[PDB]
Design a protein around this ligand. Structure first.
Ligand code: HEM
Ligand code: HEM
Ligand SMILES: Cc1cc(N)nc(COC[C@H](CN)OCc2cc(C)cc(N)n2)c1
Ligand SMILES: Cc1cc(N)nc(COC[C@H](CN)OCc2cc(C)cc(N)n2)c1
Ligand SMILES: C[C@H](O)[C@H](O)[C@H]1CNc2nc(N)[nH]c(=O)c2N1
Ligand SMILES: C[C@H](O)[C@H](O)[C@H]1CNc2nc(N)[nH]c(=O)c2N1
Ligand SMILES: [Cl-]
Ligand SMILES: [Cl-]
Lengths: 362, 362
């Protein structure tokens, strides 16, 4: 079964990819080459053109992503050549530096060797390459609760966090043939952070909030033409609501709304005062203001939805079916102010795509 | 087929209804009575207890409704006895008066004779019993755009609106055997309206906004045990977002956000200022403040979601499956501040329930 799945996925991908690239005449010969390679080796190897366009297609097919207008300008870094943990580490450091680009963020993906027999060559433990640690013990909660389990796993490996609310987790990953992952501290010169201030409310800095510049998802699997790239970190720039309406606001995250209410001078006592809603808006204005002031790329949810409308229009014009997950595409503040809220989306899964995979801790 | 559907729905409803009412021992005899009645007459007649509990079950099964905690206290008015248009009119006037209850709104449903051969006895044209007219001609838009088609239909029947932004539509309904519906102007003493003011911003009254106190849906079909009550208007009280985030805010409704921004003293020029979000919050605070000040029932979305959590807990305790439509249950502002956003719901249809039906105009 394994090989037949691979071959069937390969045929569908190569045909579609080569059609998009105006290489339709080359499909026949390429598939023959591929089928012999599968027969002889159990797998096949993407050309650089296939890998690049495959990763772009995977972004285009990501139902939960509002940012897809820009799918075709993804910067694809081919690191299928790495073999050592030093090479992986340096590749991850490089992704951070080149994606950050001094604040003018470049959407980028770095692609490591794919699974072989379902056997991973490189197993990345981080959820994002840059993320804050979380701690909970004896009533005391510090940092990002979402990171508690990974943080505890890191501390099992000899790492120790300073226990501020914003400790940077080290990179942590395992190589094929190694029993334990290795970890490496992030050089702070590589990591841009943004302090959160408000355009009109001076007291907002009293909250001492900050967030990191670049979200780099590192625990999803890129699947292209039946090949499983379990290690392929990718990043865009933030939409402000991700930080202001979720990371800093969720009760199970940094839970800052009551503190926000206090510094903006409103009571947090009555549901009918809509103090949570007002606090959310001011916190979200502050996040956008702060990123802009520092010269770090960010998009607000109105502009993002307008871009996504253009993506829908572009799909129709190209004669491609549009797929999407309405429940993720609507922004978590003022969703009915966006066109997304007022239409529906087909949530079918189309490949190439990015997929969740089981965590190696937990 | 028709009769078999009826009988099958009847069996399921009577069994479930009588179990809930502790009348399980009476099911057998009641079903026999019902089957003979179907055989002899083509249909059957609900007891008052069945009709009342049926309407309550229908509310409990309404997937899109956040207000279901209170399903068991629905006030059910049995008007299966009406035969004349004067009786229907007076029944609708009475529903308005008793549901309004001087502002302390009583959730109420008035149930008219059901369809016979799929032949309606009473056909209500209004979407809600109280709603504003809408006009559009030669570039000029007045009132509620959602009402344009019904307004035009009314004006075909000899009615004429004053063309303010808040003209009350007349009641309009058709009797079996009549070719045209009749219409009746609403007595203004029956209709409570609330002027929108803001707790801290005096200029907000310059917008001259108002809304009606009681939302009374009058175009849905109540289905109970295979019987089709196409005419059965029902009401609760408003959740504030329905008015502040949708009726007054949608671009295809009253479209007031730019005007709100101006009176609250903020620029409406840059998406990154989140002026739409800020305007939405202030407009929504104003709606809640105004209803409360006037002594007209209303609920905010935080309190409503908390009540809905209790409804979920109550269902589990009673051993009933919970059904819901996530896309309608989340409020249109700060949805991620509610527990609803963070879980999923089975959107299966369970009967008794309320259903859409084709409009007789359009
Ligand atoms: C260029 C800027 C980008 C923006 C503004 C953007 C925006 C977003 C947002 C707001 C989400 C929702 C995430 C959440 O609530 O947790 C999301 C999800 C996602 N985005 Fe994008 N995105 C961008 C670039 C990218 C890129 C470059 C890729 C891949 C190559 C990507 C793939 C995805 C995927 C797979 C998800 C779903 C993640 C999950 O299921 O947990 N996005 N995006
Ligand atoms: C007691 C106060 C109530 C509150 C606060 C409430 C709240 C709501 C809200 C916010 C919606 C969404 C409507 C929209 O966005 O257009 C809704 C929908 C609905 N509610 Fe309730 N509701 C209440 C009472 C009732 C009652 C008494 C019934 C029936 C007996 C009912 C049946 C429904 C139905 C059928 C819908 C869906 C309407 C549609 O599909 O267009 N509700 N409710
Ligand atoms: C590539 C990218 C760009 C962008 N602006 N945002 C994203 C999404 O960031 C990661 C996103 C959190 N906002 O992850 C979604 C998620 C969250 C959680 C709690 C679990 C999970 N499995 N997946 C990705
Ligand atoms: C009974 C009730 C109580 C309450 N608070 N809200 C409601 C819902 O009010 C009517 C609701 C508009 N908010 O109707 C939903 C709808 C809207 C539109 C534009 C079309 C349609 N078919 N159905 C009903
Ligand atoms: C297309 C989409 O389902 C549509 O905008 C829905 C979304 N959720 C909603 N939720 C409520 N309560 N009311 C609505 O009118 C809508 N509209
Ligand atoms: C249960 C529900 O699907 C869950 O809250 C989803 C809703 N939509 C979302 N949308 C985004 N963008 N991100 C999320 O984490 C979630 N969470
Ligand atoms: Cl994030
Ligand atoms: Cl309404």
């Amino acid at each position: 079964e394994e090989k037949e799945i691979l071959w069937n996925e390969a045929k569908a991908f190569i045909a579609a990819c080569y059609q998009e690239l105006g290489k339709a005449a080359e499909v026949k010969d390429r598939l023959a080459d591929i089928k012999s390679e599968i027969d002889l080796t159990g797998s096949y190897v993407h050309t650089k053109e296939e890998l690049e366009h495959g990763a772009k297609m995977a972004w285009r097919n990501s139902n939960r992503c509002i940012g897809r207008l820009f799918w075709n300008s993804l910067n694809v870094i081919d690191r299928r050549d790495v073999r050592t943990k030093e090479e992986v580490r340096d590749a991850l450091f490089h992704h951070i530096e080149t994606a950050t680009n001094n604040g003018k963020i470049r959407p980028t993906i770095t692609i490591f060797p794919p699974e072989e027999k379902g056997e991973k060559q490189v197993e990345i433990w981080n959820h994002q390459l840059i993320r804050y640690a979380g701690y909970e013990s004896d009533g005391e909660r510090i940092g990002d609760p979402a990171s508690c389990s990974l943080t505890a796993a890191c501390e099992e490996l000899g790492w120790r966090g300073e226990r501020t609310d914003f400790d940077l987790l080290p990179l942590i990953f395992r190589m094929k043939g190694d029993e334990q992952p290795v970890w490496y501290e992030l050089p702070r010169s590589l990591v841009i952070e943004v302090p959160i201030t408000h355009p009109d409310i001076e007291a907002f800095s009293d909250l001492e909030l900050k967030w990191y510049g670049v979200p780099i998802i590192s625990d999803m699997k890129l699947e292209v033409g039946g090949i499983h790239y379990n290690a392929a970190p990718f990043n865009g720039w933030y939409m402000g609501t991700e930080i202001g309406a979720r990371n800093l606001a969720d009760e199970k995250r940094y839970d800052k709304l009551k503190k926000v209410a206090s510094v903006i001078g409103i009571a947090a006592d009555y549901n009918t005062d809509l103090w949570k809603d007002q606090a959310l808006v001011e916190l979200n204005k502050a996040v956008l203001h702060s990123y802009k002031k520092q010269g770090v790329s960010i998009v607000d949810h109105h502009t993002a939805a307008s871009q996504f409308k253009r993506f829908e229009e572009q799909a129709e014009e190209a004669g491609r079916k549009l797929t999407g997950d309405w429940t993720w595409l609507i922004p978590p503040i003022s969703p009915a102010a966006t066109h997304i809220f007022h239409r529906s989306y087909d949530n079918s899964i189309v490949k190439p795509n990015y997929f969740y995979q089981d965590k190696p801790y937990e």
